[PDB]
Amino acid sequence: SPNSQYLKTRILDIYTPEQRAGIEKSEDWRQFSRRMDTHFPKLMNELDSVYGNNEALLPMLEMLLAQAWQSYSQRNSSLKDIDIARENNPDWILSNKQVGGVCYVDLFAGDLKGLKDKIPYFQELGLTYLYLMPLFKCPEGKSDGGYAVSSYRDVNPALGTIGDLREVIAALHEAGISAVVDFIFNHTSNEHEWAQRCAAGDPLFDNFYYIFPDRRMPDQYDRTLREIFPDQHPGGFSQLEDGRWVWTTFNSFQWDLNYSNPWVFRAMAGEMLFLANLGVDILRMDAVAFIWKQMGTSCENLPQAHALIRAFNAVMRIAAPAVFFKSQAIVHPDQVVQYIGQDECQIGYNPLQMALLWNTLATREVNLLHQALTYRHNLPEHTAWVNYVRSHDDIGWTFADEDAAYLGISGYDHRQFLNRFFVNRFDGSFARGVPFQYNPSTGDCRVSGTAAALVGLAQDDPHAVDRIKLLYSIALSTGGLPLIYLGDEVGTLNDDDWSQDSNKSDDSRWAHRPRYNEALYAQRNDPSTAAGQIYQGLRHMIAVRQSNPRFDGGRLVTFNTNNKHIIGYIRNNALLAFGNFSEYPQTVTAHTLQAMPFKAHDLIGGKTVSLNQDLTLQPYQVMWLEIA
């Protein structure tokens, strides 16, 4: 295995003796050289555990590092100042000052020029993080909402140009907002240049995807493969016009990239460097679970998958230190947490808390949520959770069956109930969601629908507004970076005409991806409307989170409320949070509150509450008590 000093002299070999002496004395090389010495051993070690003694490893590594230097040299100085800042402040993600938001540029603002006009609103809401959905070129028609990339360099013409994106990112930075986008790396479209060339037999793009001659290997892999979209195709394979079969974990038009080929890592690390120099602060690493395949296994969460992410991390620590990663792993809780590490993905989605928030709204019992917050919330140093209520995706009931079994709950039967409840197929249900990917072969099903539709705002349930304020309060105060699905702050309902659209009809996720509702946003300052009650309710919680230091960090200690309907947790041994998940008044007795001080100020309602007597919480009431 080669060292950092050796490879650095090979990088400088492209320069003539006269200009080489000039680069060695420059500030850009002094920083790159320091970061190479510190972070290259990790890059070498991770790439070695995956590729081993591959002939292509050394030539790939040298090509990658040469490209990494050119990328850091070309990098803007304003971005180099953010590199220095975050290199010396790894806990910026754990700060209570951070509140995030997510939206589709076309649905929320039309185009990129329209999005920069929406920036004063993001500042009004108090956002310091903005996640933009797939901006790059995708095929016309079905593209999985932009998740089938045809070109990582060209922006979708309907949204604008590559220059318009640089202007948006710079305008976000001036407003004190971090730019977050997707790094669609597990797969590309079947219309991508690499895809067409690999299938055509071009030797430069050989083994870039997993192409098989018949059903022999696909049948053997399918014995252990989980179906993500069973409505589209069985297993994880799709057929071409010539008779060959290709690995398609998702849609038929989304072909899985082959990370067993060292050249695919290089190709994708080059695409990462491009995104880094645009000014992107955090990259969303979707489908991190599927980047490595092996016969006999589920081809999910394999050791080499984690090692490849850690290798990508090292490329960033060397050529763009400001670029952090956000893991999206909608898998078993034991596997979700393994992607989170300072040397892997610094932040990651929290599907467990999210799914259990909805479960608790259905059952009215906090048992599962309490268990999750007590045993699975705390993370290692320099890492944070991305807590959310809703996303562009469906809700999967990804709680642990083993955790549920300890509480006397059968995982299969509980998911049967939750799915029936949330799609309005259970008596007295307030939820108005629609099914997504019902698999008759497994009994598994996911739920589509906005936060407002699932709490009952569509039929004007009087408890609906309070339910949204309750779910968001947990995401905003548990510890981690909260991500608001833009449109939820005004109670936006489902898109009614998704089902009668040929390009959207086979994907129920479009029910929860509606356009910017002008009418609801114009009612945001009116306390008499549902939209105004939700906005002012959420805005108050955001204001309190950002100004009060008691919410700092990602750590928590749960509090036993002795009431199965009320959740309780303590932040920094100074903030006691209570959340009633029942539609009836619930009580935390004087007995349970004996250790707490006599009086405590509530940050939600503003009243001074006595804890020396019985505390009765109103239907879906949230209380943030200052106990120190």
Ligand SMILES: *[C@@H]1O[C@H](CO)[C@@H](O)[C@H](O)[C@H]1O
């Ligand atoms: C992550 O990626 C999958 C496949 O591209 C997409 O369907 C999901 O919506 C996205 O979050």
